[PDB]
């Protein structure tokens, strides 16, 4: 339930790069746009969104980990929590890039 309101305590909660956020916005939709720029308030929202999403997936993996009474976490505990937040669209390409990372991390 409710305990306390929001807290802008961003002294340690201001950590992620800005070049990776603008590097993850390529998006070529088969010649329908120019894709010149994104303003900085959207980049600050994307940085705070990525940080909050990593905390979101970690609490959902730990909250479905206690139902199976396992005190650990895994790929079958993180990706089995991606359907609980409604993100199966992310679940399919994370599987093919995890298998490309496993097929290229051996060399």
Residues 2-61 that bind other proteins (CB under 8 A): 2-9, 12-13, 15, 20-21, 24-25, 27, 32-39, 41-42, 45-46, 48-59, 61
| Minimum distance from residue 41 beta carbon to other proteins (Å) | 5
d(CA 58, CA 78): 7
CA-based nearest residue to 64, from 95, 56, 48, 51: 56
CB of 103 to other proteins, least distance (A): 9
Least distance in angstroms from the C-beta of 45 to other proteins: 5
DSSP 87-101: -HHHHHHHHHHHHHH
Number of residues that bind other proteins (CB under 8 A): 77
Tell the smallest beta-carbon distance from residue 14 to other proteins (Å).
12
Q: State the sign of the Cα–Cα–Cα–Cα dihedral 2, 11, 16, 71.
A: negative
* Residue 79 per-residue DSSP state: T
For the record, the structure tokens of 3 come out as: 């305990």
For residues 63 to 92, the per-residue mask of contacts with other proteins, x marking binding by CB under 8 A and - elsewhere, is x-x----xxxxxxxxxxx-x-xxxxxxx-x
């Amino acid at each position: 339930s409710y305990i306390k309101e929001q807290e802008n305590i961003t002294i340690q909660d201001l950590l992620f790069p800005k070049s990776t956020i603008v590097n993850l916005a390529r998006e070529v939709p088969q010649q329908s746009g120019k894709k010149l720029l994104i303003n900085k308030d959207a980049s600050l929202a994307l940085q705070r969104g990525a940080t909050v999403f990593v905390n979101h997936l970690l609490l959902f993996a730990r909250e479905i980990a206690k139902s199976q009474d396992k005190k650990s976490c895994s790929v079958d505990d993180v990706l089995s929590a991606l359907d609980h937040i409604g993100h199966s669209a992310l679940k399919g390409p994370v599987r093919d890039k995890l298998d490309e990372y496993q097929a290229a991390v051996e060399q």
